[PDB]
Amino acid sequence: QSKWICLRLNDAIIKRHVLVLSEYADLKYLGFEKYKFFEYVIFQFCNDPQLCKIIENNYNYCMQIFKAPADDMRDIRHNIKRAFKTPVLGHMCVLSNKPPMYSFLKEWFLLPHYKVVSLKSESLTWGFPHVVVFDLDSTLITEEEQVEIRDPFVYDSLQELHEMGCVLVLWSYGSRDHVAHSMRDVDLEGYFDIIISEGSTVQEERSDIVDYNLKKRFIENKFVFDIHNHRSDNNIPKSPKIVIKYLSDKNVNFFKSITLVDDLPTNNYAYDFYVKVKRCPTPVQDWEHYHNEIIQNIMDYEQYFIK
């Protein structure tokens, strides 16, 4: 729980992006001209008032000051988007000069700064999208061996979601092999954007080919997720790290918000919204309230603050 401060660059010669500082003097690692590549830069609030005073004397950029005891990724993003009246923001940069130990921010994408100039821009949407994450396990299937959609209304609602310019990401924790048969039974390849599998487990991520039968164009959902917590518990969170990774692999580079729809609250690590799926061995046809929830969650920022 700390006070916090942020740079706002005068000329966003590169836009949307933000950086995080351990020292005000870290600027020396950045040196000449490199500063023009970042729109904002957060720093933990000065302990010495002279630092803040020198900041106040500096004219090279605008700045803001605030309290954020809420040491959370999404809450900090909310506060910054409030301060700078902006719906969408870029990635958070990092250097070999290791970041400050604000390691509660551990679970996120980390941008090796030099890539920033190398970054592409993407066709995939003409406007900045929202994103929604889904599962197979007990999720929107009926629970029997052969599954209906909980409503064909939902079936077509998935398609219409494209009208809003929002992204559909399914990561089955369930086993890889059966999902192909599942989609052959009911195909949403024309209805859904992104597919991932085998997330069920956390595994010892420490230092110590597919589509042979039918020409699917899928991939090894490679196990590249850290143990990340080095502790005795039982949790397999959905990983914003991996999600943003595959997004930028699809050149998806900016977004307004991300929501999770899942049967496990535990896996939600401060996702913007969570929809606990109702378990359903029969077609509940309840979707309209899910629709309402999602629509209002989207609408939150039409007032220019999520609340």
Binding site: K28, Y29, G31, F32, S96, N97
Partner: peptide, 9 residues
């Protein structure tokens, strides 16, 4: 580069 600021110094 980490080399860069040494060159600058």
């Amino acid at each position: 580069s980490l080399e860069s600021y040494e060159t600058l110094k």
